[PDB]
């Protein structure tokens with residue numbers, strides 16, 4: 001019940017919403033069917049439109065008008081945005097030259113520069129270049145302020161998951177808004193785009209920027225706007241709030257536009273109909289900036305122009321139907337479109353079976369435009385699994401395609417030429433970032449970054465302490481003139497042991513054998529040196545990784561590689577080695593094919609054993625430092641140490657052996673040397689964070705050797721590739737991956753072909769940030785470089801995407 005008989009008199013767009021059953025006058029009352037009876041009359045005046053004209057100049061105030069052109073309007077804070085231009089001979093903001101804003105120039109009584117977020121739905125990154133002719137205000141913000149070529153959204157690249165990621169700094173799996181449609185099996189409740197359930201607070205996790213501000217004593221304008229409030233009125237409301245007295249005035253505001261997404265769905269991202277909505281958005285920007293200029297705030301406010309996701313060409317006729325794959329289609333529920341999520345129609349039906357559903361959808365048709373995954377097997381870079389609202393079965397849909405359950409769903413429910421939702425690496429889903437104001441840099445281009453990073457920066461712009469989030473605070477310091485956040489490196493928690501020779505070969509009963517007894521003061525003085533770390537400067541280029549949790553581990557040095565060996569997990573946490581451009585690939589000699597050698601620095605009790613592999617019929621083993629890349633026949637024996645061995649399914653060994661024999665050398669050739677760090681990952685509860693030992697669900701049969709869920713590699717070189725990786729004086733370049741450790745290659749439909757046709761494609765799909773590996777391993781990399789810590793934070797958040805260059 002709402003007693004809509006109250007009034008909005010003196011309450012229009014009031015900042016705190018009132019509780020039922022009193023009627024509301026806030027910018028969301030329309031959405032709740034709850035506004036007072038006089039809200040339209042008082043709060044949505046439209047008379048005479050939005051612009052001053054010559055003849056209105058100096059008019060007698062008529063309270064009926066949408067905005068005012070009378071002498072008193074500046075003190076009232078309700079002039080039309082073009083009042084000074086029309087009636088006082090002023091210029092438009094966009095017509096003024098840009099002039100660096102070195103310090104904030106604020107009116108008296110402003111404690112801090114206010115922040116205004118101008119968020120645009122469906123604003124694809126290439127619009128900044130392609131629509132430049134028709135967006136002069138936005139082009140001025142971009143060229144005068146700080147901009148990125150594009151900003152990466154989160155997956156899925158839908159509206160609510162991305163706007164709430166902007167507000168919280170969290171992945172959708174953590175904030176809980178995991179799609180535009182959801183079922184929560186604990187609440188037994190559904191979330192939909194249309195309706196009232198979406199307003200229930202229990203859906204919305206984490207702590208959004210407006211709550212962070214409020215809890216810390218910074219007032220916030222309400223960010224959300226009912227769709228029927230026109231854009232001009234939204235801008236006028238923001239400008240009116242900026243005229244409130246100091247003790248009532250918010251410091252942070254948001255405007256939101258439903259365009260260009262709305263028209264992009266209908267016409268496609270580059271439909272000729274798209275020019276007009278871009279003109280209209282630009283005009284809105286113009287109104288805001290003229291309005292700030294009138295208030296003398298245009299060199300005081302920080303303005304962010306930011307999109308939620310882009311838009312791709314998608315039509316009715318590019319739809320895959322699950323009815324062409326499955327016989328039991330009526331026993332499943334599908335969340336359809338640019339991603340698919342599958343669950344059982346009924347929890348009472350015990351003949352439903354995810355394993356056979358997945359098998360019926362896997363590589364079934366030559367040109368298949370979607371790939372099914374159990375959610376825990378999706379690329380870790382998507383961070384899309386740890387939430388009960390995400391269904392176990394997921395379909396990754398190719399860009400430009402839909403998936404639907406049955407053809408009738410697509411015509412009895414073409415109408416559309418654009419959509420979004422796809423993998424957040426896809427070029428068409430990238431969106432925009434521009435920052436303009438006293439706290440942002442002047443005429444500065446910054447590299448692309450992810451939208452999960454923005455919350456930290458918005459908190460910095462307001463002097464707030466961010467709630468715990470997924471951004472890496474300090475990674476976007478290079479956007480800011482001042483208010484930088486000066487992070488310190490985490491403290492190492494476990495210090496390593498440095499074992500010497502402590503065991504005789506005969507103490508080992510591992511069932512391992514090696515043909516190595518084919519056995520000099522020159523070359524034995526030298527081998528002692530290598531075991532003490534004499535080549536460590538070559539193979540460990542950025543310092544030892546720090547171990548950020550409590551554990552027991554040993555540093556092991558060798559001629560060709562260095563490792564940090566876990567006595568708890570019986571294998572390295574990390575193995576580091578450098579391959580120069582000149583390095584040669586050799587083979588594993590026949591007599592060494594099955595060679596495994598006890599490591600006399602590490603006890604039998606803290607070693608793996610070969611008998612466990614012999615008896616485990618499913619499981620084989622590989623090496624972290626590859627024997628193919630040994631520097632000499634003698635150094636090669638080090639690669640067969642039991643302390644360099646890790647468990648690998650035979651199907652995975654195909655992938656790993658190709659990466660090690662063929663790809664590392666190729667990268668060294670191309671990048672002028674590389675440094676490689678590889679190791680295992682255990683994430684059995686798919687939370688993106690390192691497992692403790694009691695979370696491990698699989699061991700090599702009959703042993704305590706834990707089986708990794710994934711294997712990573714971090715491959716670093718010099719950004720200036722005229723310098724070799726091991727002699728680099730400046731910035732670094734990195735690419736990394738987190739490969740799933742699977743017993744089959746069902747993910748790769750071309751896997752019966754030669755590895756040269758499918759392995760590298762697999763690795764590219766599983767590209768990752770160093771920061772993702774950090775979470776998954778409890779390690780901190782790049783501890784000793786000549787670079788600034790902020791620059792290293794930026795490197796650690798870099799993702800190598802393998803997309804072509806944005807623009808054609």
Ligand SMILES: *[C@@H]1O[C@H](CO)[C@@H](O[C@@H]2O[C@H](CO)[C@@H](O[C@@H]3O[C@H](CO[C@H]4O[C@H](CO)[C@@H](O)[C@H](O[C@H]5O[C@H](CO)[C@@H](O)[C@H](O)[C@@H]5O[C@H]5O[C@H](CO)[C@@H](O)[C@H](O)[C@@H]5O)[C@@H]4O)[C@@H](O)[C@H](O[C@H]4O[C@H](CO)[C@@H](O)[C@H](O)[C@@H]4O)[C@@H]3O)[C@H](O)[C@H]2NC(C)=O)[C@H](O)[C@H]1NC(C)=O
Nearest residue numbers: 173174175176204205206386387388468469470687688775
């Ligand atoms: C991305 O960044 C985020 C934020 O830093 C990280 O997420 C955090 O991870 C830690 C470590 O797991 C979590 O700590 C645990 O906290 C709970 C208490 O949880 C409640 O309080 C907090 C604080 O206000 C809330 O934020 C929580 O909100 C969650 O649940 C509600 C529903 O109740 C929901 O609205 C939210 O969307 C959110 O859901 C997500 O997280 C939960 C897990 O908390 C998960 O189930 C879900 O699928 C979503 O992903 C919540 O109200 C505490 O009880 C735990 O203690 C238990 O474990 C310890 C181990 O030490 C045991 O000893 C003990 O017996 C307990 O059983 C944890 O300490 C933290 O909650 C979580 N925060 C958020 C906002 O998600 C991510 O890890 C980051 N991701 C990556 C890849 O780095």
Ligand SMILES: Cc1cc(NC[C@@H]2CCCO2)n2ncc(-c3ccc(Cl)cc3)c2n1
Nearest residue numbers: 031119163164166167223224225226254256
């Ligand atoms: C999740 C969500 C939803 C939403 N509108 C939805 C509701 C439903 C009906 C009308 O309003 N908006 N509007 C603005 C923003 C936003 C702006 C800036 C930033 Cl930084 C973050 C979020 C936002 N976020």
Ligand SMILES: [Ca+2]
Nearest residue numbers: 683689690691
């Ligand atoms: Ca885990």
Ligand code: NA
Nearest residue numbers: 513594595596
């Ligand atoms: Na052997």
Ligand code: NA
Nearest residue numbers: 613616619620
């Ligand atoms: Na085996």
Ligand SMILES: [Zn+2]
Nearest residue numbers: 122159261265
């Ligand atoms: Zn849309």
